[PDB]
């Protein structure tokens, strides 16, 4: 595509520059180009890919929510413009899912990369579910659930309970349960068991790993506090 003539290394360097400049659309396009070089991504590169698209879709989600709220209060311009933002959001989700399925997930053998990508697949189907209506909604929801579940199965077998990727997966799957699947009890059970099992493993960590794990545990606690 449009980044095909740029060296992989230059795309990575430019992604990091874009992050510093808070140019997340550029950052995402550089990382998409890097993925399309066909080589597996390092841990740092996976994180650059995720941070880039999370910022892009995050802006779209916030905008979509504002417009959806106005539309509901109003109940063609509001509907048309909400639809425009919605289609752009769906396009970004489609692009990310496309990268994961061509061919990041199938080449990811290590737990840390496979869980990372499967969590992303769950996340971007979840973002689609937030704007979906009706039956498409049902199939989208089941695709999110399926990706999260496979990620959870691998994570529980291959990573310690304090692993930040595992923790972040469990955090997001619990919000999926609460907000998307209308399963608040499942969400609470997951967040509680995840928090408790991580707490019991903190004694094994260095000070820096301790800080990484406790940061995500605090997000689990923040949600439990709002939920119970």
């Amino acid at each position: 595509g449009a980044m095909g003539s740029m060296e992989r290394a230059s795309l990575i360097q430019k992604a990091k520059l874009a992050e510093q400049a808070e140019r997340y659309e550029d950052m995402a396009a550089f990382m998409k180009g890097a993925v399309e070089k066909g080589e597996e991504l390092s841990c740092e590169e996976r994180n650059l890919l995720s941070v880039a698209y999370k910022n892009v879709v995050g802006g779209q989600r916030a905008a979509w929510r504002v417009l959806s709220s106005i539309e509901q209060k109003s109940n063609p311009e509001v509907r048309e413009y909400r639809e425009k933002v919605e289609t752009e959001l769906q396009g970004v989700c489609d692009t990310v899912l496309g990268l994961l399925d061509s061919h990041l997930i199938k080449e990811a053998g290590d737990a840390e990369s496979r869980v990372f990508y499967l969590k992303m697949k769950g996340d971007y189907y979840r973002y689609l579910a937030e704007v979906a209506t009706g039956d498409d909604k049902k199939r989208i929801i089941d695709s999110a659930r399926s990706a999260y579940q496979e990620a959870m199965d691998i994570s529980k077998k291959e990573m310690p309970p304090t692993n930040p990727i595992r923790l972040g997966l469990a955090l997001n799957f619990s919000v999926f349960h609460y907000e998307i699947a209308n399963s608040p009890e499942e969400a609470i059970s997951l967040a509680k068991t995840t928090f408790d099992e991580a707490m019991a493993d903190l004694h094994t960590l260095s000070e820096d790993s301790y800080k990484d794990s406790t940061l995500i545990m605090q997000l689990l606690r923040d949600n439990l506090t709002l939920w119970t």
């Binding site: 910022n55 892009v56 995050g58 997000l219 949600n223």
Partner: peptide, 10 residues
């Protein structure tokens, strides 16, 4: 919005 992983960009 409930807390999820990574940048709180929305």
């Amino acid at each position: 919005m409930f807390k999820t992983e990574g940048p709180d960009s929305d």
